């Protein structure tokens, strides 16, 4: 199913010109229809003959669908804040034997990498040099991500599930923050 | 006013970097990208993109890391180009704000 | 050495990197070759120079174009001249930009 970021991840009114602010992402129609709370919230907040801008389309109070980027012409673009503080406990969650694919990066923001084994995504893991409590870890994980992306080695990803990013759109896999990347073969203590 | 346009299915062909003429506080890492499937008549075959870099704090930008990896691996991506223009080889070069490696037909039509 | 030349960019197309020079606390230098002949000598430094901040983004590309003999063009700033190379018939000047060459795009 399509993962829908919660209600609290939306700014009041996005920037004009079509460029959403830094650390924010454009909203597609699938995510907008994903949660009815967002539907009613934008139903009552915005009044008058107002049309906004979406990546996969627009919003009115019916919803239209268009080409990617076509509706960015109009000023007001919804921007979901990418980061949400879940409040989940600080633990280690490991997912093993996956490989990098489908990288995401933005302006003054984080670097993302979908991890996939056997054809399907497992966990979306990302690092942010600027924002986040793990900011001291990008200057250490960028090298590992580059190596395991150029060589495409089966690698295990250890994430901490405090923060929840939403940089990818229509992303079935959940996006989290990554702490330890390990090049390992099955049956090892350093795994 | 250039509204941000979503460019789909480019491959970064050339990587070129320069000093920024505005301030001594920013690098200009840029490139030339080419769409696949379109004719060479349109400027869609040599579309130039630029992005700055903070030279006060040492290290590498995550977006620069992506540009290196993708350009080496010659892989498709989707950019959000606009609305700032920077000089490059005497011609305008738009600034990209975020770049997403494509998954399939649905992601990058 | 500050030559006093009026701080203009210089375009050197279709060159490849050879003959890296470096010292302990000083700048690194590279000769650039086209069709077997030397064209320009460009150097970068993280310790002294107008473009001292330039050095990390420069070394990120110089290493690549030295490992891979890719098509490269050099933008040189001629304010500062260097004499590191012994008996250098080619002029050695400061390095301000490295641009990978795409003949298909015909930019370089």
């Amino acid at each position: 199913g399509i993962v829908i970021p919660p209600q609290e991840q939306i700014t009041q009114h996005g920037s004009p010109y079509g460029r959403c602010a830094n650390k924010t992402r454009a909203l597609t129609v699938a995510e907008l229809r994903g949660s009815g709370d967002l539907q009613e919230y934008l139903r009552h907040v915005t009044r008058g003959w107002s049309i906004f801008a979406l990546y996969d389309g627009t919003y009115l109070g019916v919803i239209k669908d268009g080409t990617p980027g076509g509706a960015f012409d109009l000023k007001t673009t919804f921007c979901i804040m990418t980061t949400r503080n879940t409040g989940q406990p600080a633990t280690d969650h490991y997912y093993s034997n996956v490989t990098a694919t489908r990288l995401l990066s933005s302006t003054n923001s984080r670097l993302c990498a979908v991890f996939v084994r056997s054809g399907q995504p497992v966990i979306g893991a990302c690092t942010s040099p600027y924002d986040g409590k793990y900011w001291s870890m990008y200057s250490r994980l960028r090298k590992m991500l580059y190596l395991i992306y150029v060589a495409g080695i089966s690698v295990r990803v250890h994430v901490s599930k405090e923060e929840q990013y939403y940089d990818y759109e229509d992303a079935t896999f959940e996006t989290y923050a990554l702490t330890g990347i390990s090049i390992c073969n099955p049956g090892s203590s350093l795994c | 006013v250039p509204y941000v346009l979503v460019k789909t299915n480019m491959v970064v062909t050339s990587v070129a970097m320069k000093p920024y003429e505005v301030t001594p506080t920013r690098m200009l890492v840029c490139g030339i990208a080419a769409k696949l499937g379109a004719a060479a008549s349109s400027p869609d075959a040599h579309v130039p993109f630029c992005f700055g870099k903070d030279l006060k704090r040492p290290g590498s930008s995550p977006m620069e890391v992506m540009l290196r990896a993708v350009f080496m691996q010659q892989r498709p991506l989707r950019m959000f180009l606009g609305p700032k223009q920077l000089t490059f080889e005497g011609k305008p070069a738009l600034e990209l704000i975020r770049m997403v490696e494509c998954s399939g037909k649905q992601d990058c039509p | 050495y500050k030559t006093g030349q009026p701080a203009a960019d210089h375009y050197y197309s279709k060159v490849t990197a050879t003959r890296l020079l470096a010292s302990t606390n000083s700048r690194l230098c590279a000769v650039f070759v086209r069709d077997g002949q030397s064209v320009i000598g460009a150097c970068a430094s993280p310790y002294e120079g107008r473009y001292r901040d330039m050095y990390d983004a420069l070394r990120r590309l110089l290493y690549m174009i030295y490992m891979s003999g890719l098509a490269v063009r050099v933008h040189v700033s001629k304010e500062e001249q260097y004499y590191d190379y012994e008996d250098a018939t080619f002029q050695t000047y400061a390095l301000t930009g490295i641009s990978l060459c795409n003949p298909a795009a015909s930019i370089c």
Partner: antibody, heavy 122, light 104 residues
Framework: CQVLVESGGGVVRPGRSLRLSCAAS????????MHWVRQAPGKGLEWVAI????????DYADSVKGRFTISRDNSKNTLYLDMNSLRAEDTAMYYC???????????????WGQGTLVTVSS | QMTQSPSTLSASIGDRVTITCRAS??????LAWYQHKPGNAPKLLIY???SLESGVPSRFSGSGSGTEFTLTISSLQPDDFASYYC?????????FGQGTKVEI
């Protein structure tokens, strides 16, 4: 056109907090880096505070570190400078300045404000 | 430090005026020349030591010979009566000038 109105200046005893507000109209308030600069009576202008177009980096001059906190807000199109532990030196005419290069990181300013007086004395 | 000269000067309507600003270390072409109306908001006049902002009369000109910079007003309409500041944007801190007054 671009405008920049200042507000919130007055006599403040040493060791008290104050808020200087900047309002702008006709353009996005903080799609541009915005700086705070003051002039002492009969002296040279100096630079104090910087704000990016999102709030990522906020550096301060060596004389306002640890006693000045800078702030932005795009909902109300407001720039805020908060003074705490005001000293006798900062008896100055303060105002804010928008950068011209757009989208961050220029240290030359295009549109400034009419200026507001903030005086520190017994 | 980044110091102007002269401190004050006078010139009638239709004359030319020259102001020099010097620095302890080289600033290359990272100069901004500002006009300071006493009792108003400064408006930018010269950028990059040579260029001109939009909407500015062309009489202003700048020369950027390295350490020593010059700003010349070719013809002085009464509007040019203000202070003038030289500013670097190369290295910390972003020092401004001390001002130079223009009157009759």
């Amino acid at each position: 056109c671009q405008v920049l109105v200042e507000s919130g200046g007055g006599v403040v005893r040493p060791g008290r907090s104050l808020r200087l507000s900047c309002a702008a109209s006709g353009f996005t308030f903080t799609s541009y880096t915005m700086h705070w600069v003051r002039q002492a009576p009969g002296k040279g202008l100096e630079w104090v505070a910087i704000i990016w177009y999102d709030g990522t980096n906020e550096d301060y001059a060596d004389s306002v570190k640890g006693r000045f906190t800078i702030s932005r807000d795009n909902s109300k199109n407001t720039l805020y400078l908060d003074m705490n532990s005001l000293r006798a030196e900062d008896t100055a005419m303060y105002y804010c300045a928008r950068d011209w290069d757009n989208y961050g990181y220029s240290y030359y300013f295009d549109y400034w404000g009419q200026g507001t007086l903030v005086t520190v004395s017994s | 430090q980044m110091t102007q000269s002269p401190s004050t000067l006078s010139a009638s309507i239709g004359d030319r005026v020259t102001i020099t600003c010097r620095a302890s270390q080289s600033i290359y072409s990272w100069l901004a020349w500002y006009q300071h109306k006493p009792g108003n908001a400064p408006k930018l006049l010269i950028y990059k030591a040579s260029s001109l902002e939009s909407g500015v009369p062309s009489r202003f000109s700048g020369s950027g010979s390295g350490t020593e910079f010059t700003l010349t007003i070719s013809s002085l309409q009464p509007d040019d009566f203000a202070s003038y500041y030289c500013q670097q944007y190369n290295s910390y801190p972003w020092t401004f000038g001390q001002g130079t007054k223009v009157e009759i």
